[PDB]
Amino acid sequence: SIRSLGYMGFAVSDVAAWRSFLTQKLGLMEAGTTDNGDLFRIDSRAWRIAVQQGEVDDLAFAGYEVADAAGLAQMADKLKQAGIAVTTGDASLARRRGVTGLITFADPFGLPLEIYYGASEVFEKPFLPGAAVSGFLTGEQGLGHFVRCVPDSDKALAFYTDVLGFQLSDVIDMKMGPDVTVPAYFLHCNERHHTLAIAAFPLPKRIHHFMLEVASLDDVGFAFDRVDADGLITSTLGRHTNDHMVSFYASTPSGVEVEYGWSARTVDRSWVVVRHDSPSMWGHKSV
Amino acid sequence: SIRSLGYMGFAVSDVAAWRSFLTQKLGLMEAGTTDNGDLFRIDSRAWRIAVQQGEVDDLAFAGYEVADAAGLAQMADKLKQAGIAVTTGDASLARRRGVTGLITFADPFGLPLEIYYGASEVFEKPFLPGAAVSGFLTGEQGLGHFVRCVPDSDKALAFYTDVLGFQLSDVIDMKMGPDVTVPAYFLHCNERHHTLAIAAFPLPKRIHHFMLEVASLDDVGFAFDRVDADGLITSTLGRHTNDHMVSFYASTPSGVEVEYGWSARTVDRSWVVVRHDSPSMWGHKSV
Amino acid sequence: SIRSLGYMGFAVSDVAAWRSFLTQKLGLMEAGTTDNGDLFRIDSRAWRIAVQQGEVDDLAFAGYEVADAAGLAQMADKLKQAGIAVTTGDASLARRRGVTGLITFADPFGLPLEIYYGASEVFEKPFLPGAAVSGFLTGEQGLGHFVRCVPDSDKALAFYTDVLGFQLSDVIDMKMGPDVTVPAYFLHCNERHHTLAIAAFPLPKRIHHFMLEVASLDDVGFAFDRVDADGLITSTLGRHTNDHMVSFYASTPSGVEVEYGWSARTVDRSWVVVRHDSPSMWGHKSV
Amino acid sequence: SIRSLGYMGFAVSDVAAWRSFLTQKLGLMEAGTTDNGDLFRIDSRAWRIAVQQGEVDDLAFAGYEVADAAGLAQMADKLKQAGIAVTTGDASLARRRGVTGLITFADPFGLPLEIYYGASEVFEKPFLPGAAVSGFLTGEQGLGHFVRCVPDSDKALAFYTDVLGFQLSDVIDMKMGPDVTVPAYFLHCNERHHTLAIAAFPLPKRIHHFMLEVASLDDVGFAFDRVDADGLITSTLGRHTNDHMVSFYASTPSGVEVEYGWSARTVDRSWVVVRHDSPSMWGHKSV
Amino acid sequence: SIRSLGYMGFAVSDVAAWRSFLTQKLGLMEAGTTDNGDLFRIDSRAWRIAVQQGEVDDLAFAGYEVADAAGLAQMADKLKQAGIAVTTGDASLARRRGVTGLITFADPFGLPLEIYYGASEVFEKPFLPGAAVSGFLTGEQGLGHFVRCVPDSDKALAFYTDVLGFQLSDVIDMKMGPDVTVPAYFLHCNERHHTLAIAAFPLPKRIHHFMLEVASLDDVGFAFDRVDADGLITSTLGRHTNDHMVSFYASTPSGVEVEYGWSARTVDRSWVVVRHDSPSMWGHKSV
Amino acid sequence: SIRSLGYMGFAVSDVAAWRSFLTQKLGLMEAGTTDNGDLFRIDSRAWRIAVQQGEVDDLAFAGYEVADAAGLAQMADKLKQAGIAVTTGDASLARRRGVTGLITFADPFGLPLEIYYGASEVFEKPFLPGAAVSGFLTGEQGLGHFVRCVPDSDKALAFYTDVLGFQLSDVIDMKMGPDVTVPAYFLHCNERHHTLAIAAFPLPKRIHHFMLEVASLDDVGFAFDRVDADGLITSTLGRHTNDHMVSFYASTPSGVEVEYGWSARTVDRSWVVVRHDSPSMWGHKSV
Ligand SMILES: Oc1cccc(-c2c(Cl)cccc2Cl)c1O
Ligand SMILES: Oc1cccc(-c2c(Cl)cccc2Cl)c1O
Ligand SMILES: Oc1cccc(-c2c(Cl)cccc2Cl)c1O
Ligand SMILES: Oc1cccc(-c2c(Cl)cccc2Cl)c1O
Ligand SMILES: Oc1cccc(-c2c(Cl)cccc2Cl)c1O
Ligand SMILES: Oc1cccc(-c2c(Cl)cccc2Cl)c1O
Ligand SMILES: Oc1cccc(-c2c(Cl)cccc2Cl)c1O
Ligand SMILES: Oc1cccc(-c2c(Cl)cccc2Cl)c1O
Ligand SMILES: Oc1cccc(-c2c(Cl)cccc2Cl)c1O
Ligand SMILES: Oc1cccc(-c2c(Cl)cccc2Cl)c1O
Ligand SMILES: Oc1cccc(-c2c(Cl)cccc2Cl)c1O
Ligand SMILES: Oc1cccc(-c2c(Cl)cccc2Cl)c1O
Ligand SMILES: [Fe+2]
Ligand SMILES: [Fe+2]
Ligand SMILES: [Fe+2]
Ligand SMILES: [Fe+2]
Ligand SMILES: [Fe+2]
Ligand SMILES: [Fe+2]
Ligand SMILES: [Fe+2]
Ligand SMILES: [Fe+2]
Ligand SMILES: [Fe+2]
Ligand SMILES: [Fe+2]
Ligand SMILES: [Fe+2]
Ligand SMILES: [Fe+2]
């Protein structure tokens, strides 16, 4: 089974702008440039986010991590049983991603996805943030989460749940006007409240935002100010109703947003599905 | 010696507005009306804040608490030795304040002050906040703090330090324009980083603001939204450089502000005086 | 200085009734009979309560403990300096009490008092309660407390405070009718909120009650039922406003009451004197 | 299933040198001499390491522990199902090893292996180290680990994983020259990050080294100096990238090395396989 | 002021017997032989017990530790003010003891005493017990205690209390026959319940026993058996009424006894003097 | 009284080399350049180490921190009473150092010293290390320590102890050849085992080394490798006998060494002076 979101790749029009934003604003660590593009770290892994030159200015691909080779084989079988076109990543791609093995495919709406095992650790190159950040929260919870924008949430939900094995945490019926209410589904694959959210929003991108979690409230507070200095804040500090994460949102150079948060609650086998009519307990005022 | 700030009285033009603000917005508990005015609670004490009808729309008086009768006598002696006009509170005033004994006087610039002992507890009338607040932080740290605006900080500092016994925590040189920088002094009389601050600000009131501390970040977050709904926020959420309190500021019906915060650090006998050039680590953006 | 209340002696008309009450109802341990009367234990000390045959049916004497011989000498000097008639306990009395040294005198209203040092421990005779009690709370807090009924509280307060060194914790103005309100003073000599209380009640005894503290709520609950079975309960379970002790009151065979409680808060050097208008937060309904 | 590495036997040319090295340098306890050779302890077990006279100067055999007789029977069946020649240890061998029951066989490359249950405890002969060592870490993690040098890692990996049940922790691609890179596989059978490692190194011995873990950093520091005094250090202090153990390496009298470490992290069912390009975060400089 | 008992020296007729007893039976560490005699350790200090050849077969001297040079000077002054003959230890003696400075004198009954500061630490020679002992308890509590046998306890008590500054913990009236009861005084100079005890016992030695405290119950249990094997036990395992130490007693080769214990309670400034009629809660049966 | 070592200034011939060494090797944060020279941080303080252009290639000055203005006045008085030439730092110097007030003078051998109060905090510019360091340990323990090389240790000791108020922790008699042994004195002014050490070493500099303490063992391990890469290590990893700090030593561009450590023990009022014959328990091999 999939254990977590392991990495993400972005294809952007302004690579230099993304380099500055990720390091100076968010505090990620520059980790070199390879055939995989500019690499960025948040922990012991060789890379978590890759930035390549591209006109889409959007998420180019996402990689989900399994525990081992057997886990990869099981997922490949499940995908093919579901009629999904699966391709074994050649040695060249595995090297580019720095993984031992991987398979590639796309979700129902074209997002390139990868499932891999045996990623590269670089403890000998101790993580040093590009900005003052006490630390990022990863471990068994993986990289964080992102919100997949789709045309049909039911079809997307069925794929991620029935085929990829994600489990529902909760639903938030997002009010988008007196005559518009869209359900947002939050799914987990580990203790992180959600690793993936699905919603039918009127956005021209594959995702609304990706989220990175930090170790302290000050990490969030300082980052907010660094981002605000450039007028990139899209939402004030607030706490979510479902995962109870305290965060703010900001614009990346590609328009896609990034959520930066702290203190979210986790889920387990005793968790029960619930619904909400608001996404924020307090704060998160649109600006 | 003075152990803490015990209570405050305000003389306001719109008593009903203050009643609604303190209870519905800040979460204080209405505790009846007596010859002491409308009373409000935040803990086991019979009252901490009193609101009376008055045209000044400002702090009318403040009461500092001593441990016992002997403590009151010592302070009265110290004040008279300093040439300050001290008056023993008559039985009528003691009853009004609900204290066992007290003395009255004024600081160098006219603020009526009182030092008392033996205030009234009402554990049999369990505290119930007027809004969703997990709790206020008082105990040995007292009510909170307020910032006394004065024409001459040196004279004020000498009185509060040499006569009343407050001790300096730190100084912040507040930038108020390319050609204006004013020092703000933060003083303690217990573990609370500061119970009183002194500064020469261009304000027509006795104090810039008073501060109340709550038990959780959510208490602050929810209150921010309740206040923001009425457009009364004066500063966004932020954390101070000196006491490390996370708070926001808002306007009371009298114009004087109120600071609502959480998680401040405390001080002790190992504390050393320092200086700062900024009052906020992050946040506290003027709005 | 006096460190705690160490023991109490009662002169009663029905010794057998007291023996049964203390052991079967309250859970004290029978510890033999000597020239000191019937002895009862609650901890490692050879005895804490003595019961002798007497028509007064009241507290016959109370012993306060000092840390050592030097402490005893200091107290004897303080008492004589105050004009109090002090008598050195002869070897015979010291043996009877099982102490190394002691002095005797009376308070302003005739209560025989003793100050001693070097009491006897009997760890080799492990404490075994006479009823199901997980344990009594003593240690540095001593035996517990009792309430001295006096004709003039001011005179009594001055003696116990100025001469014996007790310190005021708080005051409760006890309502005893639309036209009657009497102040009750609670005094400490260690961490126990109060070891002695003073009040001018209309009672024909030296004390209103003595109090013993137990280790768990169940100890109190079970004892309540054992006492209630004989119709001796005088007050339902409740919690006090000042020491926050959860307790109930009952009648001893002498009429004097006994308070049996659990979970009281303690005091220290940061404590400030306060006042109350009620003695109970909840419960303690007279029955 | 195999629960841990339980013991090891070495056949050496200089038994006296090994006796001195194990006790004076590493701190093991001499535990007598039997038909099993010279015995050495590190905990409550009668012996963990045996040293016999032999010209190979290498690991002579290794014993893996199962929980009980049923566990032994299951492993014997699994081995025979795999076509491995298994022999039931006769009463004579069981006595020599001090175990209740055992089976013997060899791995694909000739290393004599044993699986047993019911080893002997000697709590009545309290462990006393031969040198200043606060303690060795064993318990459910067993003796420690050793690195099996093989000609074909794939064949070895398949045997230890598919037949013996070891699970992969991670892989480190060891750089051994611009044109030489060999993968080292680390396998676990309990919480210890690895109980066995497999690699195709150019060494004329069955193992590169065996490892013993101690309770404190000082245990390692002092041992380093005792070994360094004789010029036997082969690697400076360092911390591994995979198990995060802080250790140093040294030469035994047989040339085979020994690793002595502290503070390694453990693994569980939430562990995911990863890869590394370096075996040390810091230190471990070859000397 | 004296901070603890730092070391002891014994003059014995059978040095080899003492060497074996201290190391093999009690677990002390042999620490070389100098002009100070055979040295033995129990912790980081270069030595705590010295054994020299002598016909007295008794304690030859004891050294009390002060915090620094100023402390030594103060004690020397106090002793001379009391009329005691004090001698400054020459450089030769200081070297022999491995201390920076010391003064020598005798107690009222001839026991040679020394007060010193700046003893030698040997952390570079890590403590290794001569037998299986998890550790000895020293630190701020010093070496342990010993019981000084005297002809006149009152005179001895006055010297150790009034001159050396020891403080009384408690008294035990030791029953030694229907017509014989002797008081034993236990004195502290730090947190250890007692560092010195004084009693008028009918023994031909300077001390009844010296005591060493270990870290676990097993340390005591195993030692008991090692001593019992040679028939040297003088008292079964038991727990004391005053310090609550669990221990046993045994005969040294000189006849003087040694107490070996674990888990004693400590004392502080809140401690009150008490008396006992038995020295043991349970156990300590004479054999 | 002096509370800690607050800052140090170095006058060096190669400012760029020092900039690279402090940031890239040790992990300090570049904090701008002012009339005070190049500034470097390790915590919330505006600066802790300053580097100015100078031919001495040595410590140029050191600043000791007092708690407040009163503390500064007391020290100035003590110094003048001792006949030391004290100069009040003018507003220009105070600004350069970023302190509220300070006095200047020199120790007996020419080292310029300063005592100040009210240094500048910059929490709004969150500390970001120049290399991977989890954190530096400062707080109430100050910057760290340095070893003052002097011609006459007795004279130096008397000044720092009798005049500046430092207290002795311990002494280590450093072996420097069969015929050379020099005592090194370690002094504290707070909980840090030593803030200053004094010794008569044959070095042409004012100090042998200065020391910085980090939060984890890995911080030390990684730094060791960064320094070793340039062949600047002067001592292998080891742990000291007196403060039990685990550290290594390296050469700065000025020749003066720097010690980088972790996990030292602290001292308090229960500490007793001792002596040592070795400075290291293990490690610290000269290379
Ligand atoms: O906040 C956002 C999150 C995801 C996509 C867009 C976006 C929109 Cl709504 C229109 C044009 C281009 C972009 Cl990147 C966006 O503004
Ligand atoms: O992490 C989250 C938890 C709950 C809701 C949102 C959310 C919001 Cl607040 C706005 C748009 C889209 C989403 Cl998924 C979210 O990002
Ligand atoms: O934020 C504030 C704090 C204290 C006083 C005033 C004030 C001013 Cl600045 C002008 C007129 C009236 C008032 Cl209440 C104010 O606006
Ligand atoms: O509690 C506080 C700590 C530090 C600074 C201020 C402050 C600010 Cl942020 C603006 C105006 C006046 C003050 Cl005292 C403050 O209120
Ligand atoms: O509850 C009580 C506490 C103390 C004394 C009496 C008492 C009274 Cl109020 C009258 C006669 C006899 C007694 Cl013991 C009593 O009833
Ligand atoms: O322990 C106590 C704390 C507060 C009040 C009383 C009290 C009551 Cl509840 C009734 C009569 C007398 C007293 Cl002292 C009391 O016994
Ligand atoms: O460090 C080592 C680990 C295992 C084996 C050898 C070895 C070699 Cl590489 C050659 C000859 C003999 C030996 Cl023991 C060795 O030196
Ligand atoms: O315990 C370990 C963890 C990671 C790597 C090695 C290793 C090294 Cl550092 C050199 C040679 C062989 C091995 Cl297995 C190792 O012994
Ligand atoms: O247990 C003992 C403690 C101290 C001294 C002696 C002793 C006696 Cl009681 C007589 C002769 C010799 C000795 Cl050592 C002893 O037997
Ligand atoms: O440590 C101790 C605590 C209480 C009593 C004794 C004692 C005994 Cl049990 C017998 C003889 C002498 C002594 Cl001091 C003792 O050694
Ligand atoms: O390790 C050292 C610490 C302090 C000073 C020097 C030094 C020496 Cl010993 C000679 C010339 C120049 C220097 Cl910096 C040095 O080498
Ligand atoms: O922090 C320390 C503790 C004990 C000793 C030294 C030291 C050493 Cl190891 C060599 C030269 C000088 C000193 Cl002060 C030291 O720097
Ligand atoms: Fe999100
Ligand atoms: Fe789930
Ligand atoms: Fe404030
Ligand atoms: Fe203070
Ligand atoms: Fe009571
Ligand atoms: Fe008190
Ligand atoms: Fe290894
Ligand atoms: Fe596993
Ligand atoms: Fe003893
Ligand atoms: Fe004491
Ligand atoms: Fe140092
Ligand atoms: Fe000190």
CA pair distance B16, D156, nearest whole angstrom: 84
Please return the burial class of B267, using the count of CB atoms within 10 Å of its CB with bins 0-12, 13-18 and 19+. buried
CA pair distance A266, A245, nearest whole angstrom: 10
3-class secondary-structure state, position C171: strand
How far is residue D67 from each of residues D3, D98, F260, measured CA to CA in Å? Answer: 7, 15, 47
Atom of ligand 2 nearest to the CA of A280: 9
CA pair distance A260, C284, nearest whole angstrom: 54
Cβ neighbours for B265, distance < 8 A, ≥ 6 positions apart: B193, B243, B244
Distance from CA of A128 to the nearest CA of D (A): 14
CA pair distance E111, E156, nearest whole angstrom: 11
CA pair distance F121, F41, nearest whole angstrom: 11
**Pairs across A and F, CB distance < 8 A:** 14
* Mutation target vs C (from E274, E280, E281; most C CBs, 10 A cutoff): E274
Method: X-ray
* Mutation target vs E (from F173, F272, F276, F280; most E CBs, 10 A cutoff): F272
Is the CB of B144 inside 8 Å of chain A's CB atoms?
no
Cβ atoms of B138 and B190 within 8 Å: the answer is no
From chain E, the residues in CB contact with D23 under 8 A are none
How wide is the angle at C-alpha B196 spanned by C-alphas B192 and B197, nearest 5°? 115
**What residues of chain F, 10 to 69, have a C-beta less than 8 Å from chain D?**
none
CA pair distance A176, B204, nearest whole angstrom: 45
Tokens of D137: 């870490």
Q: SS3 helix, strand, coil % of chain C, rounded to 5?
A: 20, 40, 40
Interstrand relation of F167-175 and F181-188 (parallel, antiparallel or unpaired): antiparallel
Tokens of D276: 């590394």
Cβ atoms of A82 and A106 within 8 Å: the answer is no
Is the CB of C117 inside 8 Å of chain E's CB atoms?
yes
User: Dihedral through CA B60, CA B65, CA B70, CA B73, nearest 10?
Assistant: -20
Q: What is the CA radius of gyration of chain B?
A: 18
DSSP lists the bridge partners of residue A186 as A170, A197
B164: left (phi over 0), alpha (psi -120 to 50) or beta: alpha
Atom of ligand 2 nearest to the CA of A284: 9
Contacting chains of E (3 CB pairs or more, <8 Å) are C, D, F
Is the CB of F128 inside 8 Å of chain A's CB atoms?
yes
Cβ atoms of E250 and E260 within 8 Å: the answer is yes
Candidates B126, B116, B144; CA nearest to B46 is: B126
Letter for the amino acid at F214?
A: V
Where does chain E hold its CATH 3.10.180.10 domain(s)?
A: 1-132, 133-287
> Which residue's C-alpha comes closest to atom 2 of ligand 5?
C256
Provide the CB-side half-sphere exposure for A199 (13 A, CA). 26
Candidates D184, D211, D204, D140; CA nearest to D279 is: D184
Query: Which ligand is nearest the CA of B257, by number?
Result: 3
H/E segment holding residue C16: helix C15-20
CA C24 to chain centre: 20
Cβ neighbours for F87, distance < 8 A, ≥ 6 positions apart: F103, F104, F105
Letter for the amino acid at F258?
A: V
Provide the CB-side half-sphere exposure for B120 (13 A, CA). 18
Signed CA dihedral, F127, F130, F134, F135: sign only: negative
3-class secondary-structure state, position A184: strand
Is the CB of E275 inside 8 Å of chain C's CB atoms?
yes
Beta strands in chain B (DSSP E): 2-12, 29-34, 37-41, 49-53, 58-66, 87-88, 101-106, 112-117, 119-120, 145-149, 167-175, 181-188, 196-199, 207-213, 233-240, 246-251, 257-262, 274-276, 280-283
Tokens of C12: 């009663």
How wide is the angle at C-alpha F13 spanned by C-alphas F9 and F15, nearest 5°? 65
User: Dihedral through CA E239, CA E243, CA E244, CA E250, nearest 10?
Assistant: -30
Tokens of F95: 């600004």
Provide the CB-side half-sphere exposure for B189 (13 A, CA). 24
Of D228, D237, D281, the CB nearest to F237: D237
Output the known binding site of B for Fe cation. Answer: 145, 209, 259
3-class secondary-structure state, position E284: coil
* Mutation target vs E (from F174, F246, F273, F285; most E CBs, 10 A cutoff): F273
Is the CB of C3 inside 8 Å of chain E's CB atoms?
yes
Atom of ligand 3 nearest to the CA of B58: 14
Distance from CA of F135 to the nearest CA of A (A): 10
CA pair distance F112, F89, nearest whole angstrom: 13
Protein residues with CB under 6 Å of any ligand 11 atom:
F 203-205, 208, 234, 254-257
Test F68 with B281 for CB contact under 8 angstroms. Answer: no
* Mutation target vs B (from C239, C274, C276, C278; most B CBs, 10 A cutoff): C274
Is the CB of C119 inside 8 Å of chain E's CB atoms?
yes
- CATH number of the domain at A133-287, out of 1.10.10.10, 3.40.640.10, 3.30.70.100, 3.10.180.10? 3.10.180.10
Candidates D121, D104, D115; CA nearest to D67 is: D115
Interstrand relation of E145-149 and E207-213 (parallel, antiparallel or unpaired): antiparallel
Q: How many residues does the structure list for chain E?
A: 287
How far is residue F92 from each of residues F8, F49, F53, measured CA to CA in Å? Answer: 18, 19, 19
From chain F, the residues in CB contact with E68 under 8 A are 168, 272-273
Output the known binding site of F for Fe cation. Answer: 145, 209, 259
Distance from CA of F122 to the nearest CA of B (A): 7
H/E segment holding residue F247: strand F246-251
Cβ neighbours for E92, distance < 8 A, ≥ 6 positions apart: none
CA C151 to chain centre: 19
Test A131 with F127 for CB contact under 8 angstroms. Answer: no
Residue linked to tokens 């057997």? A70
How many C-beta neighbours within 10 Å does residue E234 have? 16
Residue linked to tokens 């020293």? E138
CA A142 to chain centre: 9
How many C-beta neighbours within 10 Å does residue D162 have? 11
Taking CA atoms, what residue in D is nearest to A140?
D270
H/E segment holding residue B110: none
Cβ atoms of F244 and F179 within 8 Å: the answer is no
> Which residue's C-alpha comes closest to atom 7 of ligand 3?
B255
**What residues of chain D, 169 to 208, have a C-beta less than 8 Å from chain A?**
170-171
CA pair distance D239, F219, nearest whole angstrom: 12
Is the CB of F132 inside 8 Å of chain A's CB atoms?
yes
Cβ neighbours for D120, distance < 8 A, ≥ 6 positions apart: D45, D46, D98, D99
Interstrand relation of B49-53 and A87-88 (parallel, antiparallel or unpaired): unpaired
Beta strands in F81-232 (DSSP E): 87-88, 101-106, 112-117, 119-120, 145-149, 167-175, 181-188, 196-199, 207-213
Residue linked to tokens 């596989």? D185
Is the CB of F124 inside 8 Å of chain B's CB atoms?
yes
Is the CB of D275 inside 8 Å of chain A's CB atoms?
yes
> Which residue's C-alpha comes closest to atom 12 of ligand 7?
D255
CA C110 to chain centre: 17
CA pair distance A182, A201, nearest whole angstrom: 8
A131: left (phi over 0), alpha (psi -120 to 50) or beta: beta
Cβ atoms of B243 and B259 within 8 Å: the answer is no
Is the CB of A241 inside 8 Å of chain B's CB atoms?
no
Contacting chains of A (3 CB pairs or more, <8 Å) are B, D, F
Please return the burial class of A141, using the count of CB atoms within 10 Å of its CB with bins 0-12, 13-18 and 19+. buried
CA of B247 to the centre of ligand 15 (A): 9
Beta strands in D20-100 (DSSP E): 29-34, 37-41, 49-53, 58-66, 87-88
Tokens of C67: 């840390």
Provide the CB-side half-sphere exposure for C68 (13 A, CA). 12
Q: SS3 helix, strand, coil % of chain A, rounded to 5?
A: 20, 40, 40
Query: Which ligand is nearest the CA of D207, by number?
Result: 7
CA of A240 to the centre of ligand 1 (A): 21
Candidates B194, B195, B196, B198; CA nearest to B184 is: B198
CA pair distance D90, D92, nearest whole angstrom: 5
Letter for the amino acid at B261?
A: G
3-class secondary-structure state, position F117: strand
Candidates E207, E274, E277, E287; CA nearest to E248 is: E287
Terminus-to-terminus CA distance in chain C, angstroms? 40
Cβ atoms of C223 and C26 within 8 Å: the answer is yes
DSSP lists the bridge partners of residue D42 as none
3-class secondary-structure state, position D177: coil
Distance from CA of C13 to the nearest CA of B (A): 39
Candidates F23, F126, F113; CA nearest to F66 is: F113
Fold of D1-132: 2,3-Dihydroxybiphenyl 1,2-Dioxygenase; domain 1 (3.10.180)
The runs of H, that is alpha helices, within chain E are 15-20, 69-81, 91-97, 153-158, 217-228
Tokens of E163: 């001159």
CA pair distance B73, B57, nearest whole angstrom: 32
Interstrand relation of E167-175 and E181-188 (parallel, antiparallel or unpaired): antiparallel
Is the CB of E161 inside 8 Å of chain C's CB atoms?
no
Question: Are C and D close enough to touch, i.e. 3+ CB pairs under 8 angstroms?
Answer: no
Of B171, B272, B280, the CB nearest to F3: B272
Cβ atoms of E2 and E75 within 8 Å: the answer is yes
CA pair distance B280, B183, nearest whole angstrom: 15
User: Dihedral through CA D261, CA D267, CA D273, CA D276, nearest 10?
Assistant: -20
Tokens of C103: 């002095």
Tokens of B223: 């209150």
Protein residues with CB under 6 Å of any ligand 12 atom:
F 147, 172, 184, 197, 199, 208, 211, 240, 242-243, 245, 259, 279-280, 284
